[PDB]
Design a protein around this ligand. Structure first.
Ligand SMILES: [Zn+2]
Ligand SMILES: [Zn+2]
Length: 258
């Protein structure tokens, strides 16, 4: 009985109640490698996750999310296009009903099997609730998933999804090191955008890594066995929880690499 990814409530309908859906800095977008230009002014990007403290994993009926203790500069993201310090709040994924789709961003119109989002907030604004009201309030680090060999860093996640099958279910989820989900290269594209779900707020600097991570066909299949619904409600399997690419309009996608 609210927005989702179904026949009634999915991305094609969100504009009926979230008019910013047709706005001037919406996400995701297609990243055209012929027009996304190298920017020599981009400063080095610093992913600092060695102090990350994971807390819980939750199925909220839109995705599953892993939360972190962001109460001090534990896990942070700095540099790149960003000014100051952004703290890691949570991560979650978007994925498809089959391997040939599921990512939100695309590259030369190619869809990946899934996309990982590491959500960070700008400490200049003091807290998340203030940050999300500002155009530079959040930075989301996006990582593509392709099907290949199994990803060891995803094992802990895969092993607990059966315990959070339905909407509202959560589990303790400590000592998860998000570095295991990063590719070797931190080469990236960046542009100003929005949340890719309602409320679609235009408060995000996107940093999308060029190198995908490979996960096994079984690992991404396990994401597809989660339920959008709650316990006792009839089953609706959690798949195709991605928004398609939106018009770039008056924005430039910058590459960190030549
Ligand atoms: Zn109602
Ligand atoms: Zn997301």
């Amino acid at each position: 009985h609210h927005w989702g990814y179904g026949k009634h409530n999915g991305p094609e309908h969100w504009h009926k109640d979230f008019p910013i859906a047709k706005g001037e800095r919406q996400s995701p977008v297609d990243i055209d490698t012929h027009t996304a230009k190298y920017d020599p002014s981009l400063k080095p990007l610093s992913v600092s996750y060695d102090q990350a403290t994971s807390l819980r994993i939750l199925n909220n009926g839109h995705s599953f999310q892993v939360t972190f203790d962001d109460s001090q500069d534990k896990a942070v993201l700095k540099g790149g296009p960003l000014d100051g310090t952004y703290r890691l709040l949570q991560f979650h994924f978007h994925w498809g009903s089959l391997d040939g789709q599921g990512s939100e961003h695309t590259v030369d119109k190619k869809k990946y099997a899934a996309e990982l989002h590491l959500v960070h907030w700008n400490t200049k604004y003091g807290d998340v609730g203030k940050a999300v009201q500002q155009p530079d309030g959040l930075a989301v680090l996006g990582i593509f998933l392709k099907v290949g060999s199994a990803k060891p860093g995803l094992q802990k996640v895969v092993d607990v999804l059966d315990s959070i099958k339905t909407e509202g279910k959560s589990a303790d989820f400590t000592n998860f090191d998000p570095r295991g989900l990063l590719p070797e290269s931190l080469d990236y594209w960046t542009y100003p955008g929005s949340l890719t779900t309602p409320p679609l707020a235009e408060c995000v600097t996107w940093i999308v890594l060029k190198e995908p991570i490979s996960v096994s066909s079984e690992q991404v299949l396990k994401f597809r066995k989660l339920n959008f619904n709650g316990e006792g409600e009839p089953e609706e399997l959690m798949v195709d929880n991605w928004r398609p690419a939106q018009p770039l309009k008056n924005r430039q996608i910058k590459a960190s690499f030549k």
